[PDB]
């Protein structure tokens, strides 16, 4: 449900084939928030419970609303927490395909961490989904250093954070249908592109 720590808790000797690391939006609960659980249930349908590990970014990422105003759209401590999870995935399960996502402040955190990641780990992320991406205008819909074909951005018309503002309007809270269908559909397709099936 809203907290998932499958990577931290998982046995190295029985690594999942796919590891999904997700960062929640500002003020959301657990480490998956409102959208993460919907994506998680559909990835489990696709690869089976033992086939995919779901890991939210918890720890130092407090998802404080005010940190949306910092340079990278989140704090340095939160970025360090998410890279540490990617370094644990790469050490614990070196053959797993990685996929990732973030909502709102968590989308800026996701993009900032990918930009700073060692390229051998970054290149294992087969696909990333970003909802209400707070740096959408500033980064021109891209994640720095990461291919456009592996990126999918969900930015609703009227969601002012996609158009360079930090105002929270009702379309920013309307990503539920995307998290239920198109975003897991994109992630599963990108994993099967490289893994076959
Ligand atoms: C989507 C993502 O993980 O960025 Hg470090």
């Amino acid at each position: 449900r809203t907290t998932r720590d499958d990577l931290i808790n998982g046995n190295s000797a029985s690594c999942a084939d796919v590891i999904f690391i997700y960062a929640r939006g500002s003020t959301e609960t657990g480490n998956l928030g409102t959208l993460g659980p919907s994506i998680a249930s559909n990835l489990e349908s696709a690869f089976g419970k033992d086939g995919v590990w779901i890991q939210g970014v918890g720890g130092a990422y407090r998802a404080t609303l005010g940190d949306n105003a910092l340079p990278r759209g989140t704090s340095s401590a939160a970025i360090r927490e998410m890279l540490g999870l990617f370094q644990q995935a790469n050490t614990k399960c070196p053959d797993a395909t990685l996929i990732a996502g973030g909502y709102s402040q968590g989308a800026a955190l996701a993009a900032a961490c990918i930009e700073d990641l060692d390229s051998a780990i970054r290149d294992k992320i087969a696909g990333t989904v970003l909802f209400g991406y707070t740096k959408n205008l500033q980064n021109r819909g891209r994640i720095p250093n990461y291919p456009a074909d592996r990126t999918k951005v969900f930015c609703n018309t009227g969601d002012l954070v996609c158009t360079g503002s930090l105002i929270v309007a009702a379309p920013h809270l309307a990503y539920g249908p995307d998290a239920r269908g198109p975003a897991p559909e994109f992630l599963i397709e990108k994993v099967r592109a490289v893994r076959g099936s």
Side-chain angles (χ1 to χ4, degrees):
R1 198 201 293 269
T2 46
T3 291
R4 271 288 204 111
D5 285 301
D6 296 356
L7 172 57
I8 289 173
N9 291 337
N11 271 96
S12 196
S14 44
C15 274
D17 294 327
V18 180
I19 300 182
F20 179 60
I21 300 175
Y22 178 86
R24 77 184 126 123
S26 296
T27 327
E28 294 194 317
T29 62
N31 62 192
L32 298 179
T34 64
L35 306 180
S38 292
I39 305 171
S41 302
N42 283 295
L43 289 171
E44 290 166 358
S45 288
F47 308 109
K49 276 282 195 179
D50 299 87
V52 62
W53 281 351
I54 305 300
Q55 177 62 241
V57 179
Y61 178 41
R62 296 307 138 158
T64 304
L65 181 70
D67 289 344
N68 283 296
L70 293 178
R72 305 196 71 186
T74 191
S75 65
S76 303
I79 292 168
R80 189 123 172 196
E81 183 73 41
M82 195 179 206
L83 27 301
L85 287 173
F86 273 93
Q87 287 167 358
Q88 298 178 49
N90 182 69
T91 300
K92 236 179 188 186
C93 306
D95 298 316
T97 304
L98 309 181
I99 36 165
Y103 169 41
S104 196
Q105 187 179 160
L109 167 53
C113 157
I114 279 179
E115 181 178 18
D116 296 354
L117 263 184
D118 177 276
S119 63
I121 302 180
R122 179 164 62 225
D123 293 341
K124 291 175 168 198
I125 308 170
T128 299
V129 291
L130 300 174
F131 307 86
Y133 183 26
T134 59
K135 295 295 193 194
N136 181 243
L137 186 58
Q138 299 94 324
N139 287 335
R140 295 315 187 263
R142 294 292 220 91
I143 295 167
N145 298 324
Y146 185 75
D149 65 286
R150 308 222 306 196
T151 310
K152 193 169 178 73
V153 171
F154 293 93
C155 260
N156 286 333
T157 306
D159 180 356
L160 303 180
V161 310
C162 295
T163 235
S165 169
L166 290 172
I167 296 306
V168 176
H172 195 55
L173 280 34
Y175 290 109
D178 293 319
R180 280 173 224 132
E185 183 184 345
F186 178 76
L187 292 177
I188 292 164
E189 181 191 276
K190 291 302 167 181
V191 169
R192 299 219 250 240
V194 299
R195 288 200 154 255
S197 193

